[PDB]
Design a protein around this ligand. Structure first.
Ligand code: FAD
Ligand code: FAD
Lengths: 344, 344
């Protein structure tokens, strides 16, 4: 039986998986998404400054480091699986169940679901689920691909307007279709007005997408004025959508094992990642305790704590904490090529 | 008046300085040592795995990143100054005093002194304080400089024996002088016996150092057998000393402002970096609270918490936490060259 099932592969669950491995626990890691990272996947292009010990660089670069670390001890990773129940059969015997009916057993459970399940708002056009493999975007990880391109952005929110300005620096042109009701960034908009190669189209929506003959890429877009109904069709190289996010977090309200909650979104942590049920621990944005910050740094220290507390739940007389990695024997073989590279 | 005085420039105090700056507070940072880093300076060559988001690399490399981050907002840094007192004149008015009689004022105080003041045990030979600028070592940051060198190591502890084996891989020869009483690493010693270019010298001490004619480097060493008194003089390229550490931590026992303590070494944190005195906060290894780990990751999340709590002490209705760096306006100008490098 697995020592611990970790539900959620954001920064907190990833680090928890790593530290659980450091404490010599077998790990099962589960996430509903097709990729790990959680909310970090929402802002890949943004420069992160406030992670301890890390010089500022794009979030997506930091995410890749965090995943590699999280998966170092080779946990059993279940992607594309939504957890819908947590049951405690007995001490050191838990059941975690997915919406597809899979049931996973463990001696402990770590809940790391953060803000829950989050996806970008899908463009309301049939049927465009194939263009998101190519030139229909819901994130922007870098701007390089847009050099000398004609680019369409849909949305008037801060994110869309910032994207528009930055992409316009190297793109041939940027067109922004939006509703004025969505515009909360007054200064961001004024900047776009002064960008010579940005065309602002208020009261305008994407109505249809025109695919190429291979039907694998967007070739043109049919735009519609929301009052006049006037339509025109314009060629674009890329289409970027920023319509907000769909959020879903039903697990802890529907679960068999009820935990004391801080609010309707957060588990009450008892001074740390300890929950109201022994054997279940909560780390990251999902938990509230007095030492929390809404930071990745806190998600990390939470993950160490959860792994430690799970270990001593499973082994009452195990060491309260993990051995420092610097002198940890589990890394001795792996350290060899690193030293050799760095010290010789 | 400075917003906050941070006592101690280890990982926790460094990150606290950074995050205090993120919260738009003016910072004074003080450390007794000639360089920042605290206990990290003790293990520069060791590979660190358990800092969240950081791929394994030498501690000294990670330290340099941590210092650069810690000093980003250009705090007022006082090196080589030992803090001996903390006084609270009134709310938002603290006095921090050094052993040289300097008195620094602030609206808040963050205590980040970790395990206190630590220095390697100095070789008991007059007068060798000048060779430590050149080839008398108390740390080993990398092995490269010892290639084809004849190297002397004094000490039988785990650190000395590990150093000896690793240096012997590329050094011409390694001689280890030690007392058997100090040997706790049975297997480390057996390895050295099989190292062909390692000479083991139990019951032997460094008696004298013979300088070069410039008197700037060690040229030869006079070794003495601790029983027979037999002496011989051997040429070495480098001398490395591992005799343990001198430790001193009198501040919180001698201070004017008495804090509730966890033990004789640790301040009691009230669920977090909050101490028994409003306006004073403790972060890192110095504090005990229920969410602690003896990790740099916890030192970091502690530092964010201390900065946050100090801010709201100074400004009762300031935001409870800092704005995430990704969207923080203070970084907008600095981000430009970074984006440009990374995103364009
Ligand atoms: C736009 C933005 C900017 C930010 N910038 C910064 C910054 O600069 N610095 C910083 O420190 N923090 C920043 N943050 C906050 C940081 O992203 C979060 O603190 C961190 O992501 C929380 O990590 P987590 O693992 O606890 O939760 P999450 O990141 O939310 O990960 C939760 C994971 O659990 C999965 N999951 C959830 N539920 C279920 C279920 N029922 N079954 C299966 N799987 C499931 C989700 O798919 C998700 O992958 C920012 C946040 C936002 C949104
Ligand atoms: C050999 C070793 C291996 C380790 N390996 C790891 C690892 O792999 N991963 C990990 O996460 N952790 C590791 N640690 C632990 C980590 O080093 C500590 O958790 C961390 O250094 C604590 O940081 P700190 O800022 O709280 O305290 P410290 O590092 O102790 O820094 C305290 C600073 O305050 C200064 N100071 C103190 N007192 C006074 C005074 N009265 N006046 C002025 N200045 C003052 C000191 O000079 C010092 O610079 C290791 C520790 C040791 C010793």
């Amino acid at each position: 039986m697995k020592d611990v099932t970790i539900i959620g592969g954001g920064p907190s669950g990833l680090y928890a998986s790593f530290y659980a491995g450091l404490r010599d626990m077998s790990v099962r890691l589960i996430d509903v998404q097709s990729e790990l990272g959680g909310k970090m996947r929402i802002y890949p292009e943004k420069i992160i400054w406030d992670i301890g010990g890390i010089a500022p660089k794009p979030c997506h670069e930091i995410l890749k480091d965090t995943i590699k670390q999280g998966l170092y001890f080779k946990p059993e990773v279940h992607l594309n699986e939504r957890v819908v129940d947590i049951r405690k059969k007995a001490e050191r015997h838990f059941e975690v169940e997915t919406e597809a009916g899979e049931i996973y057993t463990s001696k402990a459970v770590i809940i790391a679901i953060g803000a829950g399940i989050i996806n970008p708002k899908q463009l309301d056009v049939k049927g465009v689920e194939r263009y998101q493999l190519t030139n229909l975007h819901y994130v922007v990880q870098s701007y390089r691909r847009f050099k000398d391109k004609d680019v369409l952005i849909s949305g008037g929110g801060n994110t869309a307007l910032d994207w528009a300005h930055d992409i316009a620096k190297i793109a041939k042109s940027v067109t922004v279709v939006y509703r004025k009701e969505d515009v909360s960034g007054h200064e961001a908009m004024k900047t776009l007005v002064t960008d010579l190669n940005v065309k602002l189209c208020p009261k305008t929506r994407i109505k249809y997408l025109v695919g190429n003959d291979d039907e694998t890429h967007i070739s043109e877009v049919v735009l519609e004025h929301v009052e006049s109904g006037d339509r025109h069709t314009v060629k674009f190289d890329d289409v970027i959508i920023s319509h907000g996010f769909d959020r879903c977090n039903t697990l802890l309200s529907e679960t068999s094992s009820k935990l004391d909650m801080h609010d309707d979104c957060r588990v009450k942590g008892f001074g740390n990642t300890t929950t109201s049920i022994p054997g279940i621990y909560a780390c990251g944005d999902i938990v509230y305790h007095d030492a929390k910050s809404h930071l990745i740094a806190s998600a990390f220290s939470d993950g160490a704590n959860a792994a430690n507390l799970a270990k001593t739940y499973i082994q009452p007389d195990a060491n309260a904490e993990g051995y420092v990695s610097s002198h940890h024997e589990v890394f001795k073989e792996a350290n060899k090529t690193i030293v050799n590279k760095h010290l010789y």
